[PDB]
Amino acid sequence: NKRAPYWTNTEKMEKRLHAVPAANTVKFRCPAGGNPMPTMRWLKNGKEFKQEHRIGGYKVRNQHWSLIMESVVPSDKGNYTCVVENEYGSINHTYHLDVVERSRHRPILQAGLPANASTVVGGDVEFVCKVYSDAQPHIQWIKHVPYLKVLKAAGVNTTDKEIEVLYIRNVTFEDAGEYTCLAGNSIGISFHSAWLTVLP
Amino acid sequence: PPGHFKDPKRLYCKNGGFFLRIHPDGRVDGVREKSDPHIKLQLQAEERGVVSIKGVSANRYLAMKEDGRLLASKSVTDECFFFERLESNNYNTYRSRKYTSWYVALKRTGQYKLGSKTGPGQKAILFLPMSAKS
């Protein structure tokens, strides 16, 4: 019963794009059969994949027709092709790998923002806040009047698009005080404060 | 690391490797084509740890109904909010704030999975947010 190589489990091969978080292990499989037992070779971006091509190299388990790369990093991104063959034929399949770096930190604000501001009564002023966060952050502006008052809060109606800048027009002496940009995500809460000074 | 929270994103499901897709007509499913215009989504926090997911093109918000069915409505309701959690394996999960035990999920076939059939250790509930560019 001599025959060319063939995929013995196409179910495990349907997932073509493997997008994984950095530091995880990636395993590509191309379960094959054939008589004689076909050989297996792996290519990265159409070229031979050598151990020296990545830190720590890679591992291959012939019994499982698999290619294993541990602790992936952004540079592992690319196409990986398995080429299986015997004297009666040659077949290949290609997977694409993408690596995404995750950050498990509470929101981080830029030092200096918002900045203190001063103006004469009747004037206009703004407070800006720049946030970095992987877990979706929730931003809001608060005035200390600890008795606090929410002046603006992100949401479906107040998109992040314009939540980062707080405008205070026709400032009165009542507007004077401490303003806070508070950013929170599932991991934690961060905030930076600025002071508004109003002059006669 | 590279990226920004207010930028639209694609939500990649580890199960089968499908991108969450929100159709103009409200249908929700998954596809593998990175070029598809209905997989570009906008995440927005309504409060700490809670977000709404909007299909930009479809201009509809993802939502989970009383029976665990997924779909997207033109108007935002309490069924459009999900607790976003970053699991230890570094993938995200989206659990309904209204139906607190059901997760957003995709089956290996590319169709959504009933919320009522989801659970914390399933591959179907694991998503990875990715840039909506190129």
UniProtKB/Swiss-Prot annotation, chain A:
Glycans are attached at residues 79, 92, 116, 157, 170. Changing residue 141 to C: In PS; severe; also in a lung squamous cell carcinoma sample; somatic mutation. Residues 5-98, 107-197 form the Ig-like C2-type domain. It is found in: Cell membrane; Golgi apparatus; Cytoplasmic vesicle. It comes from the Eukaryota. Changing residue 129 to F: In CS, JWS and PS; forms disulfide-linked dimers with constitutive kinase activity, is retained in an intracellular compartment and not detected at the cell surface. Changing residue 181 to S: In CS, JWS, PS and ABS2. Changing residue 23 to F: In PS; requires 2 nucleotide substitutions. Disulfide bonds join 30-82, 129-181. Residues 12-29 are annotated as: Heparin-binding. Coiled coil: none annotated. Changing residue 183 to G: In CS and JWS. Autophosphorylated. Binding of FGF family members together with heparan sulfate proteoglycan or heparin promotes receptor dimerization and autophosphorylation on several tyrosine residues. Autophosphorylation occurs in trans between the two FGFR molecules present in the dimer. Changing residue 134 to N: In a lung squamous cell carcinoma sample; somatic mutation. Belongs to the protein kinase superfamily. Tyr protein kinase family. Fibroblast growth factor receptor subfamily. Tyrosine-protein kinase that acts as a cell-surface receptor for fibroblast growth factors and plays an essential role in the regulation of cell proliferation, differentiation, migration and apoptosis, and in the regulation of embryonic development. Required for normal embryonic patterning, trophoblast function, limb bud development, lung morphogenesis, osteogenesis and skin development. Plays an essential role in the regulation of osteoblast differentiation, proliferation and apoptosis, and is required for normal skeleton development. It is linked to Crouzon syndrome: An autosomal dominant syndrome characterized by craniosynostosis, hypertelorism, exophthalmos and external strabismus, parrot-beaked nose, short upper lip, hypoplastic maxilla, and a relative mandibular prognathism. Jackson-Weiss syndrome: An autosomal dominant craniosynostosis syndrome characterized by craniofacial abnormalities and abnormality of the feet: broad great toes with medial deviation and tarsal-metatarsal coalescence. Monomer. Homodimer after ligand binding. Interacts predominantly with FGF1 and FGF2, but can also interact with FGF3, FGF4, FGF6, FGF7, FGF8, FGF9, FGF10, FGF17, FGF18 and FGF22 (in vitro). Ligand specificity is determined by tissue-specific expression of isoforms, and differences in the third Ig-like domain are crucial for ligand specificity. Isoform 1 has high affinity for FGF1 and FGF2, but low affinity for FGF7. Isoform 3 has high affinity for FGF1 and FGF7, and has much higher affinity for FGF7 than isoform 1 (in vitro). This is Fibroblast growth factor receptor 2. It comes from Homo sapiens. The chain holds residues 150 to 361 of 821 of the full protein.
Swiss-Prot record, chain B:
Heparin binds at residue 15. Phosphorylation at Tyr-61 regulates FGF2 unconventional secretion. Several N-termini starting at positions 94, 125, 126, 132, 143 and 162 have been identified by direct sequencing. A motif (Cell attachment site) lies at residues 25-27, 67-69. Residues 107-123 are annotated as: Heparin-binding. There is a cross-link at residue 74 (Glycyl lysine isopeptide (Lys-Gly) (interchain with G-Cter in SUMO1)). Expressed in granulosa and cumulus cells. Expressed in hepatocellular carcinoma cells, but not in non-cancerous liver tissue. Belongs to the heparin-binding growth factors family. Monomer. Homodimer. Interacts with FGFR1, FGFR2, FGFR3 and FGFR4. Affinity between fibroblast growth factors (FGFs) and their receptors is increased by heparan sulfate glycosaminoglycans that function as coreceptors. Interacts with CSPG4, FGFBP1 and TEC. Found in a complex with FGFBP1, FGF1 and FGF2. Interacts with FGFBP3. Interacts with integrin ITGAV:ITGB3; the interaction is required for FGF2 signaling. Interacts with SNORC (via the extracellular domain). Interacts with glypican GPC3. Acts as a ligand for FGFR1, FGFR2, FGFR3 and FGFR4. Also acts as an integrin ligand which is required for FGF2 signaling. Binds to integrin ITGAV:ITGB3. Plays an important role in the regulation of cell survival, cell division, cell differentiation and cell migration. Functions as a potent mitogen in vitro. Can induce angiogenesis. Mediates phosphorylation of ERK1/2 and thereby promotes retinal lens fiber differentiation. This is Fibroblast growth factor 2. It comes from Homo sapiens (Human). The gene is FGF2.
